[PDB]
Amino acid sequence: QFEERHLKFLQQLGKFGSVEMCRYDPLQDNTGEVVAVKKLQHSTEEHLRDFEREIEILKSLQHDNIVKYKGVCYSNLKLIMEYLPYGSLRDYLQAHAERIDHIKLLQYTSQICKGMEYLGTKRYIHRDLATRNILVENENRVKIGDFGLTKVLPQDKEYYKVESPIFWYAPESLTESKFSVASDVWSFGVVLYELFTYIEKSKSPPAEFMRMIGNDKQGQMIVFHLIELLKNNGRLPRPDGCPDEIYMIMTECWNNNVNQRPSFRDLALRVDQIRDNM
Numbered sequence: 001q002f003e004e005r006h007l008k009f010l011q012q013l014g015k016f017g018s019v020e021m022c023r024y025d026p027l028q029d030n031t032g033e034v035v036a037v038k039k040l041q042h043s044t045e046e047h048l049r050d051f052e053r054e055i056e057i058l059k060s061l062q063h064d065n066i067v068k069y070k071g072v073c074y075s076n077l078k079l080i081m082e083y084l085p086y087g088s089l090r091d092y093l094q095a096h097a098e099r100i101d102h103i104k105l106l107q108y109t110s111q112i113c114k115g116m117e118y119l120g121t122k123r124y125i126h127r128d129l130a131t132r133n134i135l136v137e138n139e140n141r142v143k144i145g146d147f148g149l150t151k152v153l154p155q156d157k158e159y160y161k162v163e164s165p166i167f168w169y170a171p172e173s174l175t176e177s178k179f180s181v182a183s184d185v186w187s188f189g190v191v192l193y194e195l196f197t198y199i200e201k202s203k204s205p206p207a208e209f210m211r212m213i214g215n216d217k218q219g220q221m222i223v224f225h226l227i228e229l230l231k232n233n234g235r236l237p238r239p240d241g242c243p244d245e246i247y248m249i250m251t252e253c254w255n256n257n258v259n260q261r262p263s264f265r266d267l268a269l270r271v272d273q274i275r276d277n278m
């Protein structure tokens with residue numbers, strides 16, 4: 001119930017659709033809060049339907065580590081969310097690496113873990129866990145910030161079959177397009193990896209996987225060699241300075257065996273506990 005004429009454009013925030021920063025100024029004086037505004041660019045009939053489910057998913061979530069839904073706006077459906085001022089975790093970490101210690105990295109880890117644990121109780125599968133999709137609210141709090149690929153599990157099965165972010169994808173997601181809580185855990189493992197690399201560019205999952213495959217490989221061979229690599233227990237390497245106990249968590253998340261991957265409940269308790277030993 002936001003009126004389009006009351007959303008005053010401040011700046012673009014980034015790019016299935018674009019995000020803008022706007023001030024909702026309903027009294028048309030100069031007051032009112034800044035908000036984030038997501039819309040589709042050239043909306044095909046399939047994209048609109050998916051965007052409408054994204055909205056209902058986001059509207060259905062209330063959690064300290066999940067970005068807050070505010071409303072919608074029709075002229076061109078726009079989704080209105082709270083504005084989180086420190087940007088993506090990926091960008092915040094690059095910008096402020098010098099001030100972020102391992103204890104802080106594990107505070108973030110733990111909050112992402114709690115948000116995912118909560119998603120799992122709603123039977124939601126995120127499908128796009130990555131630091132680019134986590135927002136920073138302040139130095140002490142991060143929020144899962146985008147739900148554009150998120151799906152609801154069917155009532156009677158524990159997975160769901162659908163450019164993908166292939167370097168964050170579990171093997172069964174690459175080979176069968178099967179997504180589950182277990183494949184979110186795989187990707188979480190990649191998130192934890194990103195964090196302890198501090199986003200040093202040549203240590204990103206794409207750069208590393210491309211070197212391990214061979215930087216000669218292009219187009220469509222890439223995914224085939226990645227599947228092969230993962231099937232042969234090829235893995236992203238331990239980041240410089242990542243403690244043994246943390247890399248062990250990553251490697252456990254990256255089990256080819258779906259059922260042997262840990263739960264977000266398990267992950268949250270171990271990370272919290274490692275945090276205290278520090």
Ligand SMILES: Cc1cc(Nc2nc(N[C@@H](C)c3ncc(F)cn3)ncc2Cl)[nH]n1
Pocket residue numbers: 013014015019036067081082083084085086087088132133134135144145146
């Ligand atoms: C929904 C929302 C976005 C913000 N804020 C910012 N967003 C962005 N980029 C967008 C594309 C983005 N959206 C979601 C996400 F997970 C990451 N990045 N850059 C800087 C800021 Cl400050 N507050 N609320």
